[PDB]
DNA sequence: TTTTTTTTTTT
């Protein structure tokens, strides 16, 4: 009823942040400075400020958003007149809607209401253009008149042509004029419900969402998103009714978020502890007893090294880990934990994957019969982590497809007239069993591993797990029963905090190698080669890749403590962990 | 509103270039010599000469080009009246527009503006004809009238037939008259964004462009081009509404550049150095330590020999290189560098390619129902370099598809009623691993290589790389760490100018064989054949192909120094490099 | 039916 434009403007200029620093005033000039033409607000803050305004947004969304858009636009023009003639419309987006509904629980009662859905992005289409105001010319020898067809109204989702010329009142031919037509960016995406939300024995459901204007290209497939907007029915093929008054539903996205200053203080506070490295390792798979050297290795792969890009070549910065062990050694359980804690990870099984599905697949589009590309698991994991369980179960002729993606971090396809190259910069963690299921100490190491030396040299670290019963059985049994009894280990960083810590470290820390670290690494690498040549029978080869493994591991150790330099202490830790890897495969040092 | 035709004419007639030769009057001078009806003007030159004139082209391109082009036509007629009755309209193409937009960043605000896009050409269609002014006959026994349908306007993108006869005002049926219709050449192409600008975890995007009149057949697939023109929305089936008022965008090309005299003297200056060959070799893969003999071999393949075309046959002039080595010997890094410095190169892997994708594929169009050919990797690489990494991972029944393309440089297809023969004159560089991952010195060369003798004989040079940990580890380790520390080797030819040097040499240099070079090559071949008879178990056969390899290598060495003939020094170098090849495969002379 | 790359059952 009443106008809240005065309230909205006053709220923007008078709201107080956590430190009462007016967390909203400094967003306005940032909008003006960068001409971002999109401003977001929090529903909790609006409700905390004025209860009446929050309800009107949450209920009368379709008749108040343009009103607040006009009021905000006027406030921008007075603040900076130069904003005019560059941006003709500014959008305000509301987040944190209390109306959250599961994807499977949407009913007809929720149509037309501002709701929020949490799911997984699966498909994204290229950006296109949608007409919201057309212009036609009446092709009738008497008219030759141009007019905007939808009068005082946006063009509906169905493209409708005028039947009677408004300028002359007669029918005839109408020709669209693209020059005078107004367009808006338009993208279509598909969202899927989370695996933990799917009911027993059923496939996950999917919903179609539409992103327009500045919301296009807001996320990539495989992301976890929270989308807010209005639901509506979909009219796709109305040319022929064919009975079937049944319709699907789709969502007009108003605000989207993927997956902060307070968190940064928490992250930096953690790094102040001298024993942060040991504290982080203790937080990796808290439900698994022992395997301290494995948890340390897995922690390094989460942080990785520093990729180097030069004018003529680039160097891999990711760390690859291979684990071989007897059944029941908690290999799969540890790998599942990595998927949860990594900011971006893809979990695959060796038997349930193919060569085309891992890198890229060439498929024939049924509508046109033309071949095109589909991204594989490694491509979708670019910048993240790829987990391959049961690597020994894959066919050897099929496993070689990942050799290029594991060192050059690229995928090359030359099939059916398609030549393409794709980036696959991801870290690979793989697990498997020995050749005879269990490790046989009588036989050498070569026949136990049963893998070609080419793939073995690609892995920075290799650990062989032996399940040897001994005095430690009682400790293991007590630990497992405590887990089943609900007792939880304390003094460990929670998974949510740990994920934020890793994401921050991988984005703002780039350690550099000092002179002291160079001498230690060089001496140790020379020592490997001399020792390796003494026993030319092991299946492990000390190639120059091993030298680069030491550099990557050293940078990861420094990056774990948010250090900008690789001191001698990190080099010693990198050398020490490499020693345990060599002792595992029976290479003494 | 000021008349710019006078400004244009004085700009063309009076302009000073960097060389001080009035660059812009020679182009129009050659315009009438060859009747090319197209003039190229740089945006930097017009802006410097007249800032106001340059701006008017940028923002008023729609209604300034016909006036600007019309003014140029009158000037040409004054220069030579003979241009009349040969060319009706002359097009002016503007390049160097500062408005450069990435392919993924195009939004609605860029529609109708002159922009420039850099990308890769992937698809070209055959040249067709487009109607811009039709002629119709009213089939109604009283009319028998001819009229150009679109009055004072060209035919739009969508063909439209008149509904009311302009000659009588009555409806009816109208018949097109092809002989009185005005046509224009039309071609469609697809541009793909470069792999550098593709975001993480996303597939590359594509844009459709239209070439008309003299711009047709101005490029070939795989080229890197810059296109300037106007964006517009694409209409395909406007008659069928089918809801979904969402359109795709295409581009009307106004000028195209495919990726000068100052380079000629720069290249000539480089060739004057007596040690130019060493400088070129030292500039191949600067980030790789050692492997001097492999760097020399890769340099030869970039330049290549001299193809011979005779009345009854032709002789291959390309050089093929095969490298077999232990894992971690930087084989893939060098191949990556070659794919960047080569003016035209295609990079493929053994596992990610098929027989059809390498040579040619037969694809059926579901619309018409007929079969047609699709160019493979080797066909697209004609006149350039083809890189096939991990060649040993190819299926043997699939690898044999390149036997004829490597020697006869042709692709023969007899499939689905299609018999064809395509040129595949491309050099092949391949790498792979021995049978057991690493070379075993305790076993003969026969079972280490694991490749048929038919394909081995087709390679001019074969190098077996052994990773022997010796006393050079410290030097190798220090070099690698220096690379990781940002240190760069100095006194090398950078990749950009090195690419220009190779392109110039392969185009203007055709060395000849002298009498003294013939004697050295003949004597060496006799000894090579005699020595091979000692060991017949080796899978390396000295065939007459090896004699022609010596000729090709000798020509390549001369081509490096831009020499016009092959002297005894070039023959000696060819013998020396051939000797190292034989020693590696176990033939000692 | 036909060539092609893909997952699938069945020749
Ligand atoms: Mg398991
Ligand atoms: Mg390699
Ligand atoms: Zn009208
Ligand atoms: Zn008529």
Author numbering:
A (entry chain C), B (entry chain B): 7 to 265, 275 to 604
Question: What's in the article?
Answer:
The MCM rings of archaeal organisms, such as Saccharolobus solfataricus, form a homohexameric ring.
In attempting to reveal different aspects of DNA manipulation by the MCM helicase, cryo-EM structures were determined with three different oligonucleotides of different lengths and potential for secondary structure. The first class of structure is well-structured throughout and binds a very well-ordered segment of 11 nucleotides of ssDNA within the central channel at the ATPase tier. Specifically, transformation of class 1 with six subunits engaged to DNA to class 2 with five subunits engaged illustrates a dissociation of one subunit from DNA.
